């Protein structure tokens, strides 16, 4: 069914939008009101597009796939990881590389090296070599730990990618549009509904609104695994 | 320009061939003897297999002198092609090699061994690209053919340089193709190379093959 009451969003930071002279006017038949230097998002079409969002997420996992979620902002960094360890999904820790989806051959070989270095890190032969080799392995393992630590459990492309709002990850988003991979994401008051093909326009100033829509879709995916 | 690898690595990982230890005037005369042995073996197999069909590919001719007896090892890749089937190939080798060493009538054992994988040995592979390139086949078909022909037979890295006067030209070129690591500077790395000169009809070609193993 996947409902959310209108009052649960209407109380929290959902209509609590963004700045009133920064609006990108492809929301001009969309945005409801404006108050005190902050936009007011129309919540009817918001919840309907979230109804559609959970229909098209739960249906896509009902076919049986693996989903992906991007996490980069450092305002919603660990909340995605909480929204991805229980939900079985593979996730971006803090920061993104341009090429992790489209140039995935070299990323795949980079996972050969990252898999071998985790195999050496577990095996206890790390203390054999002195501080030089241990320093190099800790540095490259730190950088791959920054990116590839959260997506070790993926081979191939996902079906639906859900991203940190719009700003920091136009890179990952445009790799998704080049690959054709459908994405269902969050929109601010001043961004594009036509980048992805369905997305969920709600402000992400609130951590609890991010925890709201992401927690909603986490139970959508886990009930997708419920089979 | 660049130093050649078999010269550069002689202290370690590459051993000499003419392995006999002597004194100065006797050093010059032993070098006489070595050069005439390599002449008789090379000219021998070139004649008695020029009448035969294919290429032989004799890579190394090691000459050793323990006692007054000379071990001669011949490292070709295709050793069944040589003999006249009882052993008479190596017997007639031993005849014509005995023809030019009998100052002191000391015995010599001509042996013959197999190359482990003949495509991976740059003198033999250089002879192959020499043979096909001496036939009217382009640089690209023959040279890529040598590359995939090599990588099916287990070689880490390879560099092929073919020198001037390719198929029809009056301006010399150099054309080199590399795959994998070929570190020419790393002294431990054990690169074996060959430098064969193809004597064509419209000129002279130069093939220089580096193999990193």
């Amino acid at each position: 069914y996947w409902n959310i009451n209108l009052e649960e969003m209407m109380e929290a930071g959902v209509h609590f939008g963004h700045g009133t002279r920064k609006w990108n006017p492809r929301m001009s038949p969309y945005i409801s009101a404006k108050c005190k230097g902050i936009h007011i998002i129309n919540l009817t079409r918001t919840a309907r597009f979230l109804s559609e969002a959970c229909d098209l997420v739960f249906d896509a996992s009902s076919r049986g796939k693996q989903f992906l979620i991007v996490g980069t902002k450092n305002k919603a960094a660990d909340s995605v990881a909480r929204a991805a360890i229980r939900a079985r999904c593979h996730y971006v820790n803090k920061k993104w590389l341009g090429g992790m989806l489209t140039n995935w051959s070299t990323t795949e070989t980079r996972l050969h090296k990252f898999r071998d270095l985790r195999m050496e890190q577990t095996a206890g032969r790390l203390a054999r070599l002195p501080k030089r080799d241990a320093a190099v392995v800790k540095r490259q393992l730190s950088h791959l730990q920054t990116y590839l630590g959260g997506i070790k459990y993926m081979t191939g492309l996902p079906d639906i990618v859900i991203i940190v709002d719009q700003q920091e990850e136009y890179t990952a988003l445009r790799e998704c549009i080049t690959l054709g991979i459908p994405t269902i994401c969050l929109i601010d008051t001043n961004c594009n509904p036509d980048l992805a093909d369905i997305s969920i326009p709600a402000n992400d100033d609130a951590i609890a609104s991010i925890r709201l829509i992401l927690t909603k879709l986490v139970f959508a995916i886990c009930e997708g695994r419920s089979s | 320009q660049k130093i050649n690898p078999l010269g550069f690595r002689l202290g370690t990982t590459q051993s000499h061939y003419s392995l006999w230890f002597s004194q100065p005037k006797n050093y010059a005369e032993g070098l006489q003897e070595d050069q005439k042995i390599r002449d008789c073996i090379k000219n021998y197999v070139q004649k008695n297999t020029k009448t035969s069909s294919g290429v032989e590919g004799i890579a190394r001719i090691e000459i050793q002198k323990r006692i007054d007896l000379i071990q001669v090892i011949i490292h070709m890749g295709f050793p069944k092609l040589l003999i006249e089937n009882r052993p008479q190939g190596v017997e007639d080798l031993k005849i014509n090699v005995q023809k030019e060493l009998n100052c002191v009538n000391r015995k010599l054992n001509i042996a013959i061994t197999r190359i482990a994988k003949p495509y991976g040995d740059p003198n033999i592979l250089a002879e192959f690209i020499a043979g096909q390139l001496k036939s009217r086949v382009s640089f690209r078909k023959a040279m890529k053919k040598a590359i995939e022909l090599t990588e099916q037979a287990d070689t880490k890295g390879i560099q092929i340089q073919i020198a001037g006067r390719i198929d029809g030209k009056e301006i010399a070129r150099i054309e080199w193709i590399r795959e994998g690591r070929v570190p020419l500077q790393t002294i431990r790395a054990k690169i074996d190379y060959c430098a064969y000169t193809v004597r064509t009809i419209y000129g002279v070609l130069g093939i220089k093959i580096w193999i990193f193993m």
Binding site: - | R140, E148, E151, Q152
Partner: protein, 171 residues
């Protein structure tokens, strides 16, 4: 590094390939003046499935097949309703190459300029006639036909779009 790429080349019965031009394009450096090969490969089955692709590399054949791998990720399908011809006439420019395509009777082999004719004889259409208005170029020409045959509509989807039930069509 398994060797010889026998299974991996995918013998290309599904897509037949041809070049349409291989121009040697060159850049100068401090050392001198060195060239690479830009080849334009148009891939496509005769089912109605084509696409261009450029490539450049210092070898000829790696530039051709590299342009092919760029090309076989760039495919449109041809709206070609009738007995292997076109629904209606079309014109669409790209850059400064304008291309007029016009459907033909079935007793007419494809008549166009070399790039347009190359992407149509690979497109499996048999009955067209396309004049080229503008450039002597081959890449923007062919890519202008590709844009000139994306935007082309059948009668069934225009009948579906307008909502009109059906008439005014012989077949």
């Amino acid at each position: 590094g398994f060797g010889s790429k026998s299974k991996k080349e995918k013998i290309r019965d599904g897509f037949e390939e041809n070049v349409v031009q291989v121009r040697r394009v060159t850049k100068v450096v401090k050392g001198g003046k060195h060239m690479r090969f830009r080849a334009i490969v148009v891939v496509g089955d005769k089912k109605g499935q084509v696409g261009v692709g450029v490539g450049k590399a210092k070898e000829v054949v790696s530039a051709v097949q590299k342009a092919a791998v760029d090309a076989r990720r760039n495919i449109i399908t041809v709206p070609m309703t009738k007995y292997l011809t076109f629904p209606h006439r079309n014109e669409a420019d790209y850059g400064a190459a304008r291309v007029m395509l016009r459907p033909a009777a079935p007793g007419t082999g494809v008549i166009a300029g070399g790039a347009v004719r190359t992407v149509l004889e690979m497109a499996g259409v048999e009955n067209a006639l396309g004049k080229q208005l503008g450039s002597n170029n081959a890449l923007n020409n062919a890519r202008a036909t590709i844009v000139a045959v994306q935007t082309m509509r059948q009668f069934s989807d225009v009948a579906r779009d307008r909502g009109i039930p059906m008439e005014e069509l012989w077949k």
